[PDB]
Specification:
The structure is a homohexamer. By secondary structure, chain A is α/β, with parallel strands linked by helices. In chain A, strands 2, 3, 4, 5, 6, 8, 11 and 12 form an 8-stranded mixed β-sheet that branches. Chain A has a single domain, classed as Ribosomal Protein S5, domain 2 (2-Layer Sandwich), CATH 3.30.230. The termini of chain A are far apart. Helix content of chain A is 32%, strand content 26%. At the C-D interface, β3 and β5 of C face α1 of D. Chains A, B, C, D, E, F: This is Archaeal Lon protease. Chains A, B, C, D, E, F: Homohexamer. Organized in a ring with a central cavity. Chains A, B, C, D, E, F: It comes from Archaeoglobus fulgidus (strain ATCC 49558 / DSM 4304 / JCM 9628 / NBRC 100126 / VC-16). Chains A, B, C, D, E, F: It is found in: Cell membrane.
Chain lengths: 200, 200, 200, 200, 200, 200
């Protein structure tokens, strides 16, 4: 069995990438759900819960500023699939942020893409460590694409036999991640129109 | 004596399956109780407490989204019957989730069924390890049925003399687990009507 | 001297039974005290502290559900009298649970009774090991009665000269334990009226 | 030199009695200090640290119940004077409990008294072993009085030439120990008034 | 070479005295360092590590009570210079305590002084064994002064040719040790003002 | 073959010097590795493991105080190359400390240097025994430089034909050792800037 899905589209689920130990990359699937708060809470358990809370608060800024969704009045649940000891996740991970936006908007995410990067409260995608290791993991998982921060493109020390078993997609801003992973359709179009101010 | 019940119906109690060491499967009975919080707490003690907290938070998402029960304002108590060293439980175990739903709704669970699987916050049943070992344990316990994730059906390496001393029931979503284990009646019917949106 | 009391009534004190090694039964007196929390804590030290924490959390469910006492806002102190190496106690021991209920309610417990059994969060008394050894210990201690789980009645391999130097009282639920050990009076009557829903 | 003081009054210091080997009694002076926690801690090091932690938790119940002092928000330091191999101390020792009450209340303790006994969380003084050996040690140390549990009075196998080189004071409850060892004055009177409910 | 410094001032370093075998005194230099804990730890290795842990916990009581320093949130490192087999150190050694206070406060210690004594959690200096042997060692090391507990002044069996090749300074309390060894200045004055309550 | 490298630069590896028997000096190469702790451990095996544990704890103080690295959350592995009977190593050896700093910082060490000395928790280099024997060993190994404690410069009883087949470098503090052995570059410069407070 596998803990990640590698093809097709799913709401609320993203293949993130992480590091275990110093340099063993792993695929870290995230699943998010949002519910009415019945003062909403971020609900996460386990080792990576702080990384989850930070990612949800940062994406909440962007969700409030650009889409006007009332995320402070929602409960946001973050699940990491597969509980590994000594995982390090990217702070304010873009995979968690993307999972949340997908779950709130009801727009499926491409499972054939993996991604790593740190989300700023302004919507930027900030550079992270271990990009080569994480790419290799995505290659081993048989993913088709990997999103990485622009500032980490120099940081890909592939191989000669690995370039390219995967498409690398550099990004500087969250709207770019969403263009690359959200299923095409009317809902995606409406959403992207709301981020035009972030582009500007 | 036995620590599990193997026939008839009980509110709040589910026969889960776990692994001890690498491959010794065991029946892991779960009992749940929910009380008013008099900001509710998840109360669990011992080695498997994190597995319990994760399962209750994930099922809480589904309970809030689909049934509208105010679980954040309830104390949820999770008990594992029999304290074994070096048990590994399925993350976000479906047995804990089912025990909680049974306890909140007051609908008894079939004790002749055992189950293993990981619950997603979206209501999916995700694949887990050690499925053959866990099935064997249920066979040894003289259970009649075992629920496993769909994605683990290939993972059943039974025997030739063991197929079939037990009915195997593959599942992809939590509402399926509930159809298979909750006592039939008006309360079960009302509950299942609330999950039709999960089916959809 | 003796570490246990064998006749008369005492608030907060119960003669539990345990096993040391494999089959040496011992009387394990428990004393409990509850104080305002001045977020309450369970306070226990030593080898059996986990058994104590589990028993107090399970009985807390029943105390909240049926009597409405705010036990989350109390400190609960559990003392085991006599510190023996390699004691094994019944998980979620009914003696600890009974000591707590006695201490909160201020209703003395019969010291001439010993008991063993595991408390479920639902209020059931679950079967335990070493029942013959534990009964013998109570006989040697000169106790008059012993409470055991119903499911362990077949498990009493007495002797021919030991049946009966003690009254054996089988139980299935916590309210039965309380009927058999709490001092008769108005406080006991009020309490038992609150458990009628557990009977039902 | 001597490790114990044998006359006059000192805050926070008590001459306890212990056994080394099987029957060599020794005077075991305890010194306690309490500080604001700046979630308080019990701080003890060495072989007898568990005995110390147990005694402080048990006396904390009584301190919270009867005097209302916030001991969970204090650091409690327990020192044993003289580090002897293979000392056995009375579980939940009344000497440690008395040292703590003296230190919190600022009321000096009579150094001419030694004591042994086990404190229950309810405030009782429970019987202990080796009472003759411990009394002899106090006699050899030239102490004037020794407090022992009531239930151990039969257990004093003195001599004919030793009865009485020391005053024996039997006790059943902690308030009695405090009446016998705390320096007389207004602070002692206030404190004892708070224990009247323990007498009752 | 020598393992101890015998003149001038150094932060964090104290010449303690110990016994090897039964009566061979030695100078036992201690060096301490305190760091932020980045729940602080006492870090000590080797044979005397328990003596070190005890001394640091006892001086921590005094540091918290009188100076208000948050020592529970500091890592305290204790080093013994020269690793000798079968050293016995004074329990809760005043040299370790002084090294810690010097290191936290940044106030140098006189290397021309050696000291021995046991620190109580109340700030007293308690008597210790082998005082003559330890004094002789300080004499052989060419130290100028030696601090000993008051109660050990009778215990100095010098010689006729050794009285006095060294100044003996008797002490009853820790503030006296600090008056005698800390470098004079504004920092020492501030510190000593905080101990006036210990004098009282 | 040789167990030590005598020219060029290597991360994590240092040529220390030790004594076998009374006066046979040997080159004692140390290799260190640091890993995330996945509460870190010092991992060392064999005869010199205590010397290794002491050196790592002392250098940890300096690493925490001056560079802010979280070494308590790292596993530190210390290997001694060549297992000789009856080696004596310098307590808190500066070679082990240097190997650790090199491994954490990723800055190679000059293999043409050997060193001996004891590290204080304050960062001083303390004198050690057998300096002549150790220097001779480095000469025989064909090393180019040897670092020794300042206080041992009088202790070099070379020869007339041995002065100088090697450069002797006296040191008083750890930052001096690092200036002399770490490969020049930006990483070394950054590190040395953090020790300026140790110089001061």
């Amino acid at each position: 069995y596998k803990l990640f899905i590698t093809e097709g589209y799913e709401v609320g689920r993203v293949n993130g990438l992480a590091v275990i130990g110093e340099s063993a990359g792993i695929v870290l699937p995230i699943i998010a759900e949002v519910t009415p708060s019945m003062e909403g809470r971020v609900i996460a358990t386990g080792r990576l819960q702080e990384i989850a809370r930070e990612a949800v608060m940062n994406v909440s800024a962007i969700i409030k500023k650009y889409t006007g969704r009332d995320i402070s009045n929602m409960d946001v649940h973050i699940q990491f699939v597969g509980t590994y000891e000594g995982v390090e996740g990217a702070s304010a991970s873009i995979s968690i942020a993307t999972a949340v936006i997908s779950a709130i908007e009801g727009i499926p995410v491409d499972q054939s893409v993996a991604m790593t990067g740190s989300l700023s409260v302004k919507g930027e995608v900030l550079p992270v460590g271990g990009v080569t290791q994480k790419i290799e993991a995505a290659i081993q998982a048989g993913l088709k694409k990997v999103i990485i921060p622009k500032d980490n493109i120099d940081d890909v020390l592939l191989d000669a036999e690995h370039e390219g078993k995967i498409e690398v997609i550099p990004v500087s801003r969250i709207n770019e991640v969403l263009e690359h992973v959200l299923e095409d359709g009317k809902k995606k179009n409406r959403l992207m129109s709301k981020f035009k101010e972030l582009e500007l």
